[PDB]
Design a protein around this nucleic acid. Sequence first.
DNA 1: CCAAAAAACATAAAATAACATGAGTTACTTTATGTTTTTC
DNA 2: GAAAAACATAAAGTAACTCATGTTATTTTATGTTTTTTGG
Lengths: 109, 109, 108
Amino acid sequence: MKFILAEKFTFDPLSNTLIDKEDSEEIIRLGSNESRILWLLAQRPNEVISRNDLHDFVWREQGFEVDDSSLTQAISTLRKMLKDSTKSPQYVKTVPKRGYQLIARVETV
Amino acid sequence: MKFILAEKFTFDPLSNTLIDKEDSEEIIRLGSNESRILWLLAQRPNEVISRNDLHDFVWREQGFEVDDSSLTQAISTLRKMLKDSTKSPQYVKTVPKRGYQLIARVETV
Amino acid sequence: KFILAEKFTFDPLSNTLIDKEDSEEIIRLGSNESRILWLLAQRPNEVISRNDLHDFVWREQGFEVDDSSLTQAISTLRKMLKDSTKSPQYVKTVPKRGYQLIARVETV
DNA sequence: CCAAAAAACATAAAATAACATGAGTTACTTTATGTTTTTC
DNA sequence: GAAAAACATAAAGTAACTCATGTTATTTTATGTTTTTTGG
């Protein structure tokens, strides 16, 4: 199932690809963690997803155990890949002591 | 659920954004606390919400324990984001020894 | 639980190597290195083709590594084992045909 | 019914925790370079 | 003998992961203003 983010990007969770419609020819290539993160964020749009839940889904449930540091780093990487800014955010937003939240628009295919 | 306050601001309690109609091309980013206060106030318009009720919804009913000072400080900040005047209050009014109340007009969307 | 050359005790489920001279460092094998030793010890003094080794060690769906990776894991496994490339004492090369565990293998 | 005192709230620092980034590590794959074995 | 092929080792490349250190949000403190209460 592919997703359209913010009227700009097209995210494919299978192939783990992000295609910007402003470049369209250029395929942004996401890591697994960053794809799984973006997936779960889109599955719960405009909802604040706890650090434990992201950790659970992105790592523990897949058989990897990792510091809660590794989530803060994945998000930095995801935001880089999205050309988001930490302020002023347009795609991934931070809610201290609560988790992360996908404030961009989410359409399915 | 979006809200229109005082026929000037557009309040989005989920994204935590404030668009002033006079500054339509500019997003005002509230803290979580400031956002959750304005939410609860707007949800009972022109009603006095006790200090404790504000405290419980904004902090305790989220697993966060803080001194009552944190509310006074979030209100100050909320007002600053609103450019409310402390005494000739347009939006958020103090009811000493009771709490705070939203005196501005509240329309859903 | 395998004992190799009356010296190392290999545990393929924790990927660990205990040298019995100084049981004070649990020698930590990589995945590929462990799975190689696992198959060799499972079939002692047999020559296992490269492809059977590759199949056993590398199964990841969609991504198939080059034959190069096996030559490198054997190097790495021998290093960990203190195996000499001539004359081999644990893992032996059979050109055009694969590798072969010549060390003594006892179970449990 | 008032003036003064005590209490409640407001604001700006200041402290502190949470999160963001820059920089190093680690494990895995592959190449670059060096050695041996096979085949004619 | 010399080439071709096969195997061995060290060194380079990459993403995950981690650690050190920078940024900012949240909480609390110190000081200032207003409101409530109270004593005379």
